[PDB]
Amino acid sequence: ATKAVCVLKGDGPVQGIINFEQKESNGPVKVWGSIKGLTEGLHGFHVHEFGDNTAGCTSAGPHFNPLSRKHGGPKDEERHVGDLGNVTADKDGVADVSIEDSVISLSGDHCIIGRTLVVHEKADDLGKGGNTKTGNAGSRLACGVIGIAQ
Amino acid sequence: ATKAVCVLKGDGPVQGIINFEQKESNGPVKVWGSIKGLTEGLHGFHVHEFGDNTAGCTSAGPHFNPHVGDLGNVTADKDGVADVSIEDSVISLSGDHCIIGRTLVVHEKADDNAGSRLACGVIGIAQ
Numbered sequence: 001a002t003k004a005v006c007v008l009k010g011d012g013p014v015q016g017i018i019n020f021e022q023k024e025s026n027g028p029v030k031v032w033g034s035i036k037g038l039t040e041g042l043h044g045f046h047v048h049e050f051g052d053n054t055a056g057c058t059s060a061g062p063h064f065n066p067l068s069r070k071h072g073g074p075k076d077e078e079r080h081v082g083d084l085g086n087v088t089a090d091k092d093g094v095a096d097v098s099i100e101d102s103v104i105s106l107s108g109d110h111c112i113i114g115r116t117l118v119v120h121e122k123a124d125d126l127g128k129g130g131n132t133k134t135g136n137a138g139s140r141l142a143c144g145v146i147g148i149a150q
Numbered sequence: 151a152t153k154a155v156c157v158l159k160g161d162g163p164v165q166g167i168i169n170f171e172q173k174e175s176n177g178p179v180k181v182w183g184s185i186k187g188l189t190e191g192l193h194g195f196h197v198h199e200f201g202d203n204t205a206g207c208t209s210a211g212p213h214f215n216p217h218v219g220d221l222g223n224v225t226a227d228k229d230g231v232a233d234v235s236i237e238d239s240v241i242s243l244s245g246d247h248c249i250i251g252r253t254l255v256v257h258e259k260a261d262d263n264a265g266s267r268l269a270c271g272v273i274g275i276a277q
């Protein structure tokens with residue numbers, strides 16, 4: 001089983017560890033871990049194109065989008081590969097992450113190893129705001145490069 | 151990937167940015183950049199197996215060797231700055247000798263034994 005990990009860091013209190021596991025190349029990727037230092041509530045959660053943290057999260061580029069699709073939520077047909085929706089933080093600022101996604105991969109062209117995972121200031125509206133390429137999730141609070149793990 | 155980048159950071163003052171470019175699949179990889187905060191002299195320069203920085207550099211695993219990850223030493227001047235310009239044909243940005251998603255580490259001592267891991271970062275896709 002392929003495994004990966006990402007340590008999210010930023011300029012403030014937001015920090016976390018997110019694990020990834022994929023049992024077969026054609027199968028879903030389990031994403032799990034926690035992010036601390038967040039405001040209680042929803043926070044956008046995305047894989048961005050570049051594993052470039054030379055300017056913090058600012059250099060990560062846009063949402064990872066190898067298929068040139070429109071932004072959406074994870075269960076939407078039309079979505080960026082990197083659209084993992086939202087995570088939810090408790091009253092202590094801790095967001096427990098437990099996602100299973102069949103669009104991201106740890107191999108092939110949907111490959112997220114070496115790219116950047118980012119958690120945002122606000123909720124990602126998933127393109128269902130009722131009135132986007134980002135989901136209006138606000139600033140990039142913390143991020144890290146996704147690496148190969150044991 | 152044709153280009154990769156790595157931001158090195160640790161618990162102390164060692165910091166830097168290292169670029170990797172491999173314009174041709176399976177071709178030589180150019181590695182360049184600068185690292186500051188080092189003691190004057192030689193410092194081991196290695197790719198470690200895991201891009202796992204959950205425990206800082208201590209979780210990066212062993213030297214990558216499916217040594218494939220051994221990039222020799224970098225040399226810091228009197229100001230603590232090491233300018234890096236290396237060509238390596240064993241590492242790669244694809245394939246079995248894939249270093250994307252692994253950890254680059256600069257060590258306390260020379261890699262003639264290299265001592266502590268002063269700074270490290272996960273190698274990310276840049277282009």
Ligand SMILES: [Zn+2]
Nearest residue numbers: 045046118120
């Ligand atoms: Zn984002």
Ligand SMILES: [Zn+2]
Nearest residue numbers: 063071080083
């Ligand atoms: Zn998106």
Ligand SMILES: [Zn+2]
Nearest residue numbers: 196213255264
């Ligand atoms: Zn080493």
